Symmetry: D2
Subunit: 268 residues, 4 copies
């Protein structure tokens, strides 16, 4: 009698046990969902990490820049879940921007090849995944992607914020296509989460100034949030994704749900 | 094992069996919630209407313009739910604007006394209710109000749209206060719902031109909505309110969730 | 050969030489406009203040809560500018909220009578003025009101922020009506300006906590603004209003132009 | 005594006499500006077109995808305007998306190589141009780019709308960098303009369905616009760009000014 009882849901984006997608997968299993996982490049690592989830789940390789992987994806999922069965949910929790497009490297100094790779992985791939998977989704289904509010510019995030602006636009178009299948498409805009990479950035991995700036941004977030914000806890974010994967928001599509403590609704 | 098992929730705004609040109450009871209802003025009528809900619920009188009603409200609720028990949820589903502030009466011709009454009932009362009820709400609790997207002007809605703009602002402030109690505050922006009053307006009760305009607005809404919009079905709206009343969006406050078929995310 | 050569423009809202409207009037006269001024209550004071403008201008009494003043206003303006002449511009620079609706008085403690008076003066009056003056405006004309960005809640501003949210909504409706006359309606959202009242508030006139909060808000504004923000200089704001009064933004209506140093476009 | 007297302004984007940039250049010259023009690929054609402007202007070659052109650009401009002189204004009026990313080709069928080229030319190039030209701009200067409101998805525009979403994000970052030079960065969001390409699209050049959809969008725009919208007249758009190039909006940066008849502020 979980929120997601009987649902078959694909979850991309697990790389470590601090990945937002690891917590999305954990909560969805706690709520009765049957998962198929996708991983990029380091499949041995990802299998070992995902062994710590409450239930075993098949793991498929998916590099979103690889056209072959995308073309075979629905067939591979169908074999993992059994012929005649379809998915009820898809989670996109994939993002990347080269170091030249984030941190202390000046905004104007990111070469376009680097920005293009970041926008491919972070924004275009949301459409790629929907194209691949809508033919094997049931009516009433739900596609969810991870967003970080790009409405205002911020220090250090730089071209990653541009990629999120493109992602929000992509989501509105995916909703139009997904609608033909009786399927919803939405993003969850999360507050900052202390993943391994984010901890490294605050520790100065992309320059001292960028680290300082991101730390300040984190502190302001909790201060602004009327219910507070705990950057070490991805669970409220994971629960929000599961809310969208459920049947409890059946008239919301092309949209953005903010799991940020309410910080974006306050100026100070 | 419902979504709202064990929760005690106050629901205002029932006047007929087509009231959005009637469907909110029905769905919340189907999901295990124990309700306290509030009604305005025609309490005999409201009791008879609410007899059709799946479970019996105490009905309290509440005129949001009446300071005495608001001052006694927490005590009356506490006696209905039993001393030592508190509310987990509050639903504001209250709206009013005099006929001079809607329909074919020119926008410039609404007297301020009429606009003020409409803003009192439709916007200020969201703060009034929160003031009255936060002292008897549990941590983890949720306050939800009903909104109609006022970001762009529209024909006929006129000063009611202005009241909704004020309501959205009020909600962001209520979230700051509610946060001190561990309580969330959010609005659900619904698409148009064919309540008795809305059917009457399309039938020309506020002038022929206003009727025509609202009919066109309804038709465009379903056309824009990537998953469609059924104005005769309040259930998707009710489910969305219950989503916010649950523990599944624990990091969303001061915010607006759109239960509109995705229509606001599309231009045509 | 000024920006506003040959234009006849009404300017409300002068009370001291630090009033934003004083600087709007000064810049418009420097740019060739012929003004009619309106003042509330302390007409002797206002006449003495306005004697410091570059050119003499007729001063008319206007209490926006007074129905008689509003009904006679067009006739009084026509006699000041001469029969057969019409206005090309109207400036609304009027705002008020009782002390119970701003500062350290808790948000929930503002009585509705006080909030209603504030919304009357600050929001409804924008429509009142347009109703009164559109019949004596020329095609190509411009109505401009003063706004403070209410998209996010902030400390101390409280019900004044709610009034601004209502004002933004009112402006979109006024644009629909003004359009019938070939007239534009827009708001200028200014950054914080150190008027006499604002200096007093920072000095603690509405409580110490509110003062502290507003000071912090001012400091953050200049820090966020990519071109900086000088709260002691109303001239950039005045120039922006004159831009809207000119023929140089002829396809902008129902809209908001931000004269805030770009602060609202940045998170930190 | 024009609006732009004494200013030196670079204008990109002229290809035909229906180019929005042709009208921007014409109005800026009528207002006293001294121009430097940039053109892509068909320089013989562009020279002949630009011979119809009120004043002669030097024409420089600029392919925004060509790193060499961008690296030599400031030097070439300096030789055209004379050593010791700098620019006061820069106009980006450059946009492109391959046919696979617009029209009736399904959204999911645009290959990433095509989308990437479109985002390079339409969004990244706004940053490229600013990088190249800020070192030769005067304090008080202004960078302006052309936008089409991408806040909601629309039929046929598809990946071009995604590129505009990215452009709006880029503009907020460019404003931060431009601020260091005392320079503003803003976009003008225009309503639809019947350029040669747009006429061709309505005539069915990108498929019949896409043509039909764009025609409907155009008709709705004028209907929504409180002051109307004339798609055959680029002059109101050009005047708006010149407003931003002037000293009359000195506190607006990282922002978007809508020259759309007010259509985006209205639902119907
Ligand atoms: N951490 C934050 O503060 C935060 C805040 C809001 C949103 N988000 C977003 O949440 C999502 C998940 O990120 P995270 O913070 O959990 O970091 P993470 O590093 O744990 O996850 C990012 C994932 O992207 C995957 N990925 C990268 N390139 C790929 C490719 N070519 N094909 C397939 N997958 C690829 C990685 O393998 C990894 O699993 C991202 O979209 C991120 O932008 C993060
Ligand atoms: N029907 C729609 O199309 C639509 C769309 C979006 C949002 N909404 C909103 O949903 C809410 C519920 O409205 P509805 O459409 O279900 O109509 P309704 O007429 O069924 O409900 C409105 C309720 O407001 C109550 N009310 C009026 N004055 C009151 C007072 N002084 N004190 C206490 N209660 C008072 C009425 O008694 C009634 O129960 C309103 O906020 C409305 O604006 C409606
Ligand atoms: N000062 C700021 O930081 C700031 C920032 C953004 C916007 N604004 C807005 O600019 C406008 C002008 O305010 P200001 O800051 O220059 O302060 P101000 O006190 O100098 O001007 C306010 C004016 O409102 C007038 N007014 C009050 N009640 C009235 C009534 N019943 N009828 C007619 N006029 C009445 C007052 O006489 C006064 O002239 C207001 O709308 C204000 O909200 C101010
Ligand atoms: N026409 C509309 O309805 C409309 C509406 C809003 C905004 N806009 C925008 O206005 C701008 C101007 O477009 P237009 O409608 O005047 O069309 P246009 O075809 O006349 O102008 C587009 C220009 O982009 C230039 N360009 C293309 N690739 C280039 C490259 N690699 N390097 C340099 N320049 C290149 C072309 O040479 C051409 O001069 C674009 O940003 C467009 O998106 C157009
Ligand atoms: C919003 C945001 C922040 C960070 C550090 N990474 C990402 S995606 C790269 C994952 O480590 N997205
Ligand atoms: C958005 C909206 C529309 C209507 C007709 N009424 C309301 S409240 C009055 C209830 O019948 N709100
Ligand atoms: C935004 C804002 C701030 C303040 C102090 N007053 C106002 S109107 C009252 C004028 O002194 N408006
Ligand atoms: C918004 C928009 C529409 C169109 C047809 N083209 C462009 S850029 C290509 C120029 O002909 N931008
Ligand atoms: Mg294990
Ligand atoms: Mg019964
Ligand atoms: Mg004098
Ligand atoms: Mg010639």
């Amino acid at each position: 009698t979980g929120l997601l009882d009987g649902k078959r849901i694909l979850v991309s984006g697990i790389i470590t046990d601090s990945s937002i997608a690891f917590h999305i997968a954990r909560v969805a299993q706690e709520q009765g969902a049957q998962l198929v996982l996708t991983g990029f490049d380091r499949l041995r690592l990802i299998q070992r990490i995902t062994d710590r989830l409450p239930a075993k789940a098949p793991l498929l390789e998916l590099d979103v820049q690889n056209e072959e992987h995308l073309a075979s994806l629905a067939g591979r999922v169908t074999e993992a879940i059994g012929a005649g069965n379809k998915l009820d949910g898809v989670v996109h929790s994939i993002g990347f921007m080269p170091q030249t497009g984030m941190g202390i490297n000046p905004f104007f100094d990111a070469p376009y090849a680097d920005v293009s790779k970041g926008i491919h992985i972070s924004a275009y791939s949301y459409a790629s995944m929907a194209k691949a998977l809508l033919p094997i989704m049931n009516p009433g289904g739900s596609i969810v992607g991870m967003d970080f509010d790009p409405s205002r510019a911020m220090p250090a995030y730089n071209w990653m914020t541009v990629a999120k602006s493109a992602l929000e636009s992509v989501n509105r178009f995916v909703a139009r296509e997904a609608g033909k299948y009786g399927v919803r498409s939405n993003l969850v805009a999360a507050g900052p989460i202390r993943t391994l990479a984010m901890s490294a950035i605050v520790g100065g991995a992309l320059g001292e100034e960028a680290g300082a700036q991101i730390q300040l941004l984190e502190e302001g977030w909790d201060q602004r949030a009327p219910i507070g914000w705990n950057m070490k806890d991805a669970t409220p974010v994971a629960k929000t994704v599961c809310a969208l994967l459920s049947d409890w928001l059946p008239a919301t599509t092309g949209d953005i749900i903010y799991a940020d403590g309410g910080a974006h609704t306050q100026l100070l």
